[PDB]
Amino acid sequence: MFMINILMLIIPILLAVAFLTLVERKVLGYMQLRKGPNVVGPYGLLQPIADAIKLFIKEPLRPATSSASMFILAPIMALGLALTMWIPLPMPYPLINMNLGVLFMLAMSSLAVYSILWSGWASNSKYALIGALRAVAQTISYEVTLAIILLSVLLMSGSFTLSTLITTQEQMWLILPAWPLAMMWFISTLAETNRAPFDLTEGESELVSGFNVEYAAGPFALFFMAEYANIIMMNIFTAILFLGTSHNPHMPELYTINFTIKSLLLTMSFLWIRASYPRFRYDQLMHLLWKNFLPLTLALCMWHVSLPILTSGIPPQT
Amino acid sequence: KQDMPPVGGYGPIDYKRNLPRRGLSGYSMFAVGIGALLFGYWSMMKWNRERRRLQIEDFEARIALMP
Ligand SMILES: CCCCCCCCCCCCCCCCCC(=O)OC[C@H](COP(=O)(O)OCCN)OC(=O)CCCCCCCCCCCCCCCCC
Q: Which positions bear N-formylmethionine (chain A)?
């Protein structure tokens, strides 16, 4: 029945990414002093069944000027590498056990931006043309900030797999010891996935609407359901790579219970920001990475290398 | 002969500007901060120095049998 363990995953998650869109504007509602979608629910909890159905009724135009062969294979992705990445992710028991799999995320973190470059180019001119070009450029310069500061800690835990990374955070919430890094693990995923303070990719201010501009109701649910299938995953990751829970070979169930009451707090962070801060004006946006974020990330790497060796600490792995 | 202004008495309420409250300033931070980071590592160097002590124990059974 291994095929019914899968399809029990893909389906029950599409409800979260659906019902996030509701808690989008309730939480961001009371920052403003008001209430959130209310009239339709009664509580509102019934809103997203009505919204999923307005789009696919609503007619899906294509530009007369487009290349239809690319205008499909691209979105036929924004929903794969979002739903594949979930596969080897322990909670506690991952569906797959990949030996070195931690590295496998970067494989699928790196291969999504090659679905932006298609779509914005697939269609047409300068609002999605050079406007989907220069959100490529920022999306690849926030990896080098990443793979390093992912690679740092992994000196402090011994291997590339995720079954060890529950063992080492036992009674030490891995955020003490590298708290300088942890910050930069946060501003990255918020800068890379195109969210609030570095917002530019999806346009509001700097342009009209980035990269979404052409898709009518028909395809544009996918992206608007793809872009929220990354955001609740990196944030359902960070908390396996920092704030660890305590496995329990007996009541596995109490592992996940206490696990979603963390990863679900953590997420409610990209909403708790977006009410707050303004945007960066694309110069300042990269111009603050090389100069500023990076020099440290190298420097710390020269540090977490020696700290095990200089304490006879060297973590028990191959 | 019903008009607005009261007989006497008012505020005012000021227009002035203040809220600069801190908050562990001026090197008080960098003091607690570097203090936590250490107790992080001291919490390592022991778990990680214990876990190796089990590591050898595990490779022991392998060599024990396998003649
Ligand atoms: C648009 C519609 C048309 C497209 C439809 C089809 C699209 C397919 C796209 C493929 C995208 C995902 C491919 C990524 C490959 C990743 C494989 C991997 O990393 O598996 C990890 C695992 C490592 O093995 P390890 O854990 O070290 O040892 C276990 C010991 N028991 O490895 C293993 O366990 C062994 C590997 C078994 C899998 C066999 C090889 C699978 C990979 C073939 C991919 C073919 C490329 C397809 C096109 C890719 C384009 C992106």
A: 1
Among A72, A85, A87, A99, residue to substitute to test ligand 1 (most atoms within 8 Å of Cβ) = A99
User: Which resolution, in Å, applies to this structure?
Assistant: 5.0
Q: Are A75 and A120 in contact (CB under 8 A)?
A: no
- Find all residues with CB under 8 Å of A101, minimum gap 6, and list them: A88, A160, A161, A162
Name the residue facing A176 among B39, B45, B49 (closest C-beta). Answer: B39
Query: 3-state DSSP: chain A helix, strand, coil percent, rounded to 5?
Result: 50, 0, 50
Ligand 1 contacts CB of residue A104 (under 6 A) = yes
Report the residue from A168, A171, A313 with minimal CB separation from B49.
A313
Q: Are A216 and A59 in contact (CB under 8 A)?
A: yes
- Cβ atoms of A180 and A114 closer than 8 Å: no
- Which two tokens mark A13? 């998650």
Task: Choose among A264, A224, A204: nearest CA to A51.
Answer: A224
**Residue B32: Cβ-neighbour burial (10 angstroms; 0-12, 13-18, 19+):** exposed
Identify whether the C-beta of residue B36 lies closer than 8 Å to the C-beta of residue A179. Answer: yes
Q: Give the phi and the psi of residue A85 in degrees, each rounded to 5.
A: -55, -30
* Of residues A178, A180, A316, nearest to B52 (C-beta): A316
A164 inside 8 A of chain B by CB: no
Whether A201 contacts A133, CB under 8 Å: no
C-alpha A93/C-alpha A162 separation (Å) is 10
- Closest listed residue to residue A277, CA positions, set A177, A196, A217: A196
Interface mutation vs chain A, best among B37, B43, B48, B59, most A CBs within 10 Å: B48
A:B CB pairs within 8 Å: 48
Check: CB of residue A234 under 8 Å from CB of residue A266: no
Method used to obtain the model: cryo-EM
The CB density around residue A124, as the number of other CB atoms within 10 Å, is 16
The Cα B64–Cα A43 span in angstroms is 65
**Do A62 and A68 contact (CB within 8 A), yes or no?**
yes
Inter-chain contact B49–A167, Cβ cutoff 8 Å?
A: no
